[PDB]
C-alpha cells in the first residue's frame, strides 16, 4: 500500500484509470445511470418547473 497509493497519485487527472484503482461498489450500482444524468431533465420539464411552484397554504375559516 505504499505502491498502490502511489499509482492512485499518478492516475489522478487521467480518465481511464485501471480497473483496480476504480471503485468496485457492486456490479448493479456501477452501471445504473450515474446520478449526474439519472436526474437530468428535458427542457420541457424545466419549463413546467419554473412557472407554478407548489404553493404553501392552509385551510380552515
Amino acid at each position: 500500500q505504499k505502491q498502490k497509493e502511489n499509482l492512485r497519485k499518478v492516475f489522478k487527472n487521467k480518465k481511464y484509470k485501471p480497473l483496480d484503482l476504480r471503485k468496485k461498489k457492486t456490479r448493479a450500482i456501477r452501471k445504473a445511470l450515474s446520478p449526474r444524468d439519472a436526474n437530468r431533465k428535458t427542457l420541457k420539464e424545466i419549463r413546467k418547473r419554473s412557472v407554478f411552484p407548489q404553493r404553501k397554504f392552509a385551510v380552515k375559516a
Binding site: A28, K31, A32, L33, D37, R40, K41, T42
Partner: peptide, 18 residues
C-alpha cells in the same frame, strides 16, 4: 443502452434502467 448519447439524453433515457 450504455452509449454516451442514449444515457445523456433524457427523453429516451428511461430504458437505461434495470
Amino acid at each position: 443502452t450504455h452509449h454516451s448519447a442514449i444515457r445523456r439524453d433524457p427523453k429516451i433515457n428511461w430504458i437505461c434502467k434495470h
